[PDB]
RNA sequence: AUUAAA
RNA sequence: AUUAAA
């Protein structure tokens, strides 16, 4: 069986990071019941268009309060991921070099991941409300 | 991702071929490469395939209750919810002998017949509007599936 | 338990 | 011009 993979995991050179991630990744709607669906949407952060604006700070605010309040008022969970999301950039490269699925996202572009867990008709409406409020953060020029 | 792929090809070339599963998995990860923007705020496409309960209600035909006379009640729902709803899956066609239609010819046009009988709600709008339209459509479509 | 739209 | 949440 595939447990051959376990023999590869221990014996593979740690210098191959993406292969060791893929091998460890390989370890393996009804509306009338109306149980809780989960959704997610990855929203790009326009650093190409606004390179002089720091979005990560405007989004989080003091001790993350502004992101917490948006999460609370939209009833969603938001996570800032991608290249440039971490505060320590030397740690961000070594964690990207670490190439663990948890930190794998750093290879991608700076973006927000909004998650919502609710019954389906509510879960879609909550995500739509969150997408309307988050653009005020991602659009400095929202006047006109 | 301009940084990710050159490291895969570097691993591909430098890796020991004796690792067959690991080398196969990085090749599968390479074949993949051969996400919303709200400041440009262009239209996305959302869809949700909503099964309708024939296992729970085998005696109730929903597809007729959904369409109505000449599809008036379904188009009225598509108008008020501003979505495109298409009934697909096994039993969607009224003629079930002409169903299992081709399907060994294998056209993705007809591939949906292998899926269970459902309703695919598609909505085309900007992301904030698209997600809010879908949520409203799922609100109203319950009323057809709860006799 | 006759609803058939795109 | 600062903000650093999970």
Numbering used by the authors:
A (entry chain A): 5 to 32, 46 to 161
B (entry chain B): 2 to 35, 45 to 157
What do the authors of the reporting publication say about this deposited model?
The structures of the T-STAR QUA1-KH and STAR domains in complex with RNA show that the QUA1 and the KH domains form compact dimers, with each KH domain binding one RNA molecule, while the QUA2 domain does not adopt a fixed orientation. No electron density could be observed for the N-terminal half of the linker connecting the QUA1 to the KH domain (residues 35–42), suggesting that this region is disordered, while the C-terminal half of the linker (residues 43–53) is well defined in the structures. Strikingly, no electron density could be observed for the QUA2 region of T-STAR in all our data sets, suggesting that the QUA2 region does not adopt a well-defined orientation. Accordingly, the structure of T-STAR STAR in complex with AUUAAA overlay very well with the structure of T-STAR QUA1-KH in complex with UAAU with a backbone RMSD of 0.9 Å for the QUA1-KH atoms. Interestingly, the presence of the QUA2 region in the STAR domains increases the radius of gyration and maximal dimensions both in the absence and presence of RNA. This is consistent with the QUA2 domain being flexibly attached to the QUA1-KH domain dimer, and may explain that no electron density is observed for the QUA2 domain in the crystal structures of the T-STAR STAR and KH-QUA2 domains. The absence of electron density for the QUA2 domain in our X-ray data sets suggests that the QUA2 domain of T-STAR does not contribute to RNA binding.
T-STAR is a tissue-specific STAR protein mainly expressed in the testis and brain3426, and regulates the alternative splicing of CD44, Tra2β, Tau, VGEF and Neurexin pre-mRNAs262728. Taken together, our data reveal a unique mode of RNA recognition and dimerization by the STAR proteins Sam68 and T-STAR that is crucial for their function in alternative splicing.
